[PDB]
Design a protein around this ligand. Sequence first.
Ligand SMILES: N=C(N)c1ccc(C(F)(F)F)cc1
Length: 330
Amino acid sequence: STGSATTTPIDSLDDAYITPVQIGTPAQTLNLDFDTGSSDLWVFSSETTASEVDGQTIYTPSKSTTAKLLSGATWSISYGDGSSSSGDVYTDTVSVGGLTVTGQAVESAKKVSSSFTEDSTIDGLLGLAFSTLNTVSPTQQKTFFDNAKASLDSPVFTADLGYHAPGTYNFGFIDTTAYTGSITYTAVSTKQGFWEWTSTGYAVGSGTFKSTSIDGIADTGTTLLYLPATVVSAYWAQVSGAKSSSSVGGYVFPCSATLPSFTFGVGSARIVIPGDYIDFGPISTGSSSCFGGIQSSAGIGINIFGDVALKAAFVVFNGATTPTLGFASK
Ligand SMILES: N=C(N)c1ccc(C(F)(F)F)cc1
């Protein structure tokens, strides 16, 4: 089997991407944030505290003839930004782009933090990291990909995120028309539960490539590119007037600037992030200070190849017995 679904930016900045997901019988379609940095499929629901729902589409298990309470199971998760959610668990039928999994754990939110409430465009998360990160207790649950894998034509999914435009998530096949050149594969460590790999270096603009190992995760659920402070300083030093602002929370730059590209290495291959992908717009409405798309990972504890990097590539998440990651230009 295979599946193919379009993913759509939630706003004009590509702050996140949503993909429609069918849950239950008859189907309930929710727009979920596919997150290769976590491993829970959770949804706004008829169980979510009413005052914490503001425009989201909710899953109502009682309206689904295939929903079953997973008795005794609960979940609770925290994300990079301090946001969180928690609740109880149902199993139900879940389909993504024509690919169906029966018996999928659907984590129903009883509680969500304010940042979720405040974002009406995201109805929940669909985690695509390794199932060892799943938070369900006392019986950990498998991700949608994990459950689907044995039915797939090939045990892979691909992320093809757009810059200010829709893109695609495919399951079970590699669309050889969606990229240019060849795919370069690179080793993955699953020891922290992430799609963790080592970039071979970077370049800023038209500058020379610096060969240096940069360990980090391929994370569709993180907006920005978070790299070591040395690398980030070298990038922003090429932008007149750019500065790290402790009050804003990172590097800012004049909105009048033309940003340089940023290149990262994948083995002997190179992925070029155009400068415009690194512009996250005014820090506040009407400001002439703009927020940068490359930020320091110092204090996070890990480097994160988030959407700013991934959207410059066609990315293969290869879930074979020894997982690997592939990157191609497009
Ligand atoms: N995409 C995610 N859900 C995510 C959240 C937190 C981190 C960490 F805190 F570890 F950096 C990394 C990834």
